[PDB]
């Protein structure tokens, strides 16, 4: 299955050239750009692994693009993503993710059930791929 | 090819795409409407070019189950039962770009005992759409079956009466003025001096509830003090509207427990609390021996204007469900819109057992109120004493005048106030029940210029407002006269 | 004092004249009138007591003066009340009540103040005349 | 072992002409029918994947057949059931559900004990078939 996290999920795979594109748009805008890797594709799993600090005081979309490839070659198989991060007043917060790779098979997840009081069901989800492998080795 | 493709509904009817609202069945010229209906009489300006009956069928269908576009989904269910009908569509007198839509709502539509839920659907969307230029909702038939889920009035006007023991005169009283500023403790004052000089009740204005200059708890304490020293002083029941309005329903019933607490008889509420609340608050108030008087804070914003809203008529009905004991329904005569004709309507509506259909009142409707108890009408702002001939004759006996600046504004102090209108009040009376044609220009006037010679307060009254009238143009006005 | 319950009491005690339109009234709309009887002014003294049964049958408003005044008669010193009642579904309730007589001397009531919680008080209205002597001696 | 789900699954495995015969009964009586596969088998799975749209305008047997022989083709290794709709005030639901198709081999389940408070079991019921493997392929 395709992991549907990030806001381009629904489209192919973004080539260099796109994900390029997306990361001046948003430096435009004046975001932090910052590159974050998982092998935990589950949806709660709020803390993807850092890639150095976020870019902050850069003004080439290139040098993001640079980051992004030295991500790609040194990080184990998995999932890399893109934020931009906003620190205006009233934001303070990510205003785009996307995700620019994820692993050439995803089996995804099962649902677990457990009874809870009368008919209520107790839900956990569970990757495969986490629940057979330690981080590093998952994909 | 593939399977959704040699799935797809074919019908002319549920075929995927946009069809007209009378072409999905919420339209039906000779639909027989059952006692189980929820009926609504709404009137339509179409936007120009739309259709009357499009426009009519479009209020019907998304009220009820349609969107814009047909959805396979309505065949899961008993989709012709659930549709909405708009089935009668006559033009506007004196009009032929407004049109009054009679629309039937199947029962099970609607939630059990919830006003939250029939105006979910009846006023959720359709006010909004584009395809109608305006839209408002001028009376309703709530059936007997919908109706016997709802406990109607908490008290009602005859139980109301005999906690009071007062019958046979309107029931008087006055908001208490200014109507910010004052401490609790002056608020104390103002009640005891009004009720020791004859009123029944005072009030808490609608905006009094709780603020720097004084603070709830200070007010009600001190309002006890004054109603039992009025009681005291008089061997009558006495009261005031605590008002019990809140941000939260936590804060609405600590209010009203105090209330309760200390022997209050009665507590107000504002209609901008809201539905859920003003139903949890009628409920609470016949659990806990209360009357509940309901400000109709707000109403005028959607209710004043004839072509668009809600009319007050219907907001009777649906409030005289959720059991409040009081409304505010209008005066003719004082500061606020009043046409005689349809305030006597809401005046019905409140009272009686039953409506037959009356055009000139605004009922279009026959509807039985299914045993649930009548509620009190508030005849209220910018009314005086001069004015009772007048007040008698267009409100009727079952009702409750209220005069705050009528009272607090009378030159000899607010004893002098309150004694002048129930002397009014009382002769005005005294003389109906004898015959005398107290409405006449000439008589009524002199009943109490006569009551006036042995009455000082009256005279005064008499003479400081005797010319004062609020003589405007109605905006919410009836379309068949009398 | 003046006790004020009763719906004509801001008034001039009424004439049998007075009374009689009053009876006339309450008749022509089909109302049952029945006189009643107390020396306990409270507020909440919700039973007066009942002079004879109501008058249900009678076409005539000098059958209730008639028995006003054998009432006025037979009674001690007080209050005497007319009421009507209309038996009329939703209604079923008294729709007027005045009071006919009353003693020369009201002495009235005290406010009697009970210390509650904090500064709650617990009020209890009471009467001079029914604290000094029993019922049928109290003016 | 057997899932035994649906309302003959306690009988053989039915033949397409017994399938048949039962569709035909449901259609006769003005019932949609419409087909569906799994492949998690748990009791407290309700919403199993729908083969297209449940087929509302379909008079004919045959056609039913079909789709599911379709479902049947196209679908990976699982369960398919048949369902028919009643979509009468008074029903507004399912009347009728039977599998169709169950896999070669079904391991089944075995429950899952928590400690709760006192004696009390917390359950919870696990597929073997869905924790080994993800959706498409766990027969
Ligand atoms: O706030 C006011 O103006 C009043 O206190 C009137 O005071 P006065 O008696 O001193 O005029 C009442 O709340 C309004 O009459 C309510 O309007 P409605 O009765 O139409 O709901
Ligand atoms: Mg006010």
């Given at each position: 299955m395709r992991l549907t996290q990030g806001c381009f999920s629904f489209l192919p795979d973004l080539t260099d050239a796109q994900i390029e594109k997306q990361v001046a748009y948003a430096m435009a805008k004046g975001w932090a750009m910052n590159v974050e890797w998982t092998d935990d594709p589950h949806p709660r799993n709020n803390y993807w692994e850092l890639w150095g600090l976020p870019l902050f005081d850069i003004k080439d979309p290139a040098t993001?693009?640079?980051?992004?490839?030295?991500?790609?070659?040194?990080?184990?198989?998995?999932?890399?993503?893109?934020?931009?991060?906003?620190?205006?007043?009233?934001?303070?917060?990510?205003?785009?993710?996307?995700?620019?790779?994820?692993?050439?098979?995803?089996?995804?997840?099962?649902?677990?059930?457990?009874?809870?009081?009368?008919?209520?069901?107790?839900?956990?989800?569970?990757s495969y791929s986490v629940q057979a492998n330690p981080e590093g080795s998952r994909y | 090819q593939s399977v959704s493709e040699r799935t797809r509904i074919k019908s002319d009817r549920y075929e995927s795409g946009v069809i007209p609202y009378a072409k999905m069945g919420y339209w039906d010229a000779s639909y027989t409407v059952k006692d189980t209906d929820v009926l609504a009489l709404f009137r339509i300006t179409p936007q120009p070019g739309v259709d009357p009956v499009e426009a009519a069928a479009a209020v019907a269908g998304e009220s009820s189950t349609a969107t814009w576009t047909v959805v396979w989904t309505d065949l899961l269910t008993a989709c012709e039962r659930y549709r909405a009908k708009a089935y009668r569509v006559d033009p506007v007198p004196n009009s032929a770009d407004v049109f009054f839509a009679f629309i039937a709502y199947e029962c099970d539509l609607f939630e059990e005992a919830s006003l939250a839920n029939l105006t979910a659907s009846i006023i959720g969307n359709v006010f909004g759409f584009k395809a109608v230029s305006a839209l408002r909702l001028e009376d309703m038939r709530i059936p007997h079956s919908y109706l016997x889920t709802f406990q109607g009035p908490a008290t009602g006007i005859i139980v109301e009466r005999e906690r009071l023991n007062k019958y046979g005169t309107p029931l008087l009283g006055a908001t208490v003025k200014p109507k910010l500023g004052l401490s609790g403790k002056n608020y104390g004052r103002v009640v005891y001096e009004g009720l020791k000089g004859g009123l029944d009740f005072l009030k808490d204005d609608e905006n009094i509830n709780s603020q720097p200059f004084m603070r709830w708890r200070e007010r009600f304490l001190n309002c006890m003090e004054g109603i039992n020293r009025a009681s005291a002083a008089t061997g009558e029941v006495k009261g005031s509207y605590l008002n019990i309005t809140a941000a939260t329903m936590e804060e609405v019933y600590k209010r009203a427990e105090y209330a309760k607490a200390v022997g209050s008889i009665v507590v107000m509420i504002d209609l901008v609390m809201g539905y859920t609340a003003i139903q949890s608050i009628a409920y609470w108030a016949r659990e806990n021996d209360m009357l509940l008087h309901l400000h109709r804070a707000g109403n005028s914003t959607y209710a004043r204007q004839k072509n668009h809203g809600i009319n007050f008529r219907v907001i009777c009905k649906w409030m005289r469900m959720s059991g409040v004991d009081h409304i505010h329904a209008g005066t003719v005569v004082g500061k606020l819109e009043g046409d005689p004709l349809m305030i006597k309507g809401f005046?019905?509506?409140?009272?009686?057992?039953?409506?037959?259909v009356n055009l000139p009142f605004g009922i279009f409707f026959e509807m039985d109120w299914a045993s649930l108890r009548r509620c009190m009408p508030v005849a209220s702002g910018?009314?005086?004493?001069?004015?009772?001939?007048?007040?008698?004759?267009?409100?009727?006996?079952?009702?409750?005048?209220?005069?705050?600046?009528?009272?607090?504004?009378?030159?000899?102090?607010?004893?002098?106030?309150?004694?002048?209108?129930?002397?009014?009040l009382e002769s005005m009376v005294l003389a109906r029940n004898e015959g005398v044609d107290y409405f006449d220009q000439q008589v009524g006037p002199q009943i109490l210029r006569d009551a006036a010679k042995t009455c000082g307060p009256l005279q005064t009254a008499l003479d400081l407002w005797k010319d004062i009238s609020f003589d405007y143009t109605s905006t919410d006005t009836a379309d068949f006269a009398e």
């Open positions: 993001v693009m640079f980051e992004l490839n030295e991500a790609r070659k040194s990080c184990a198989a998995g999932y890399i993503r893109i934020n931009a991060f906003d620190a205006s007043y009233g934001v303070e917060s990510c205003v785009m993710s996307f995700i620019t790779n994820r692993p050439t098979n995803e089996p995804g997840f099962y649902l677990d059930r457990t009874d809870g009081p009368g008919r209520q069901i107790v839900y956990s989800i569970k | 005046y019905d509506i409140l009272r009686l057992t039953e409506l037959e910018g009314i005086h004493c001069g004015q009772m001939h007048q007040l008698i004759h267009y409100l009727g006996d079952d009702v409750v005048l209220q005069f705050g600046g009528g009272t607090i504004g009378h030159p000899d102090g607010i004893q002098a106030g309150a004694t002048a209108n129930r002397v009014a």
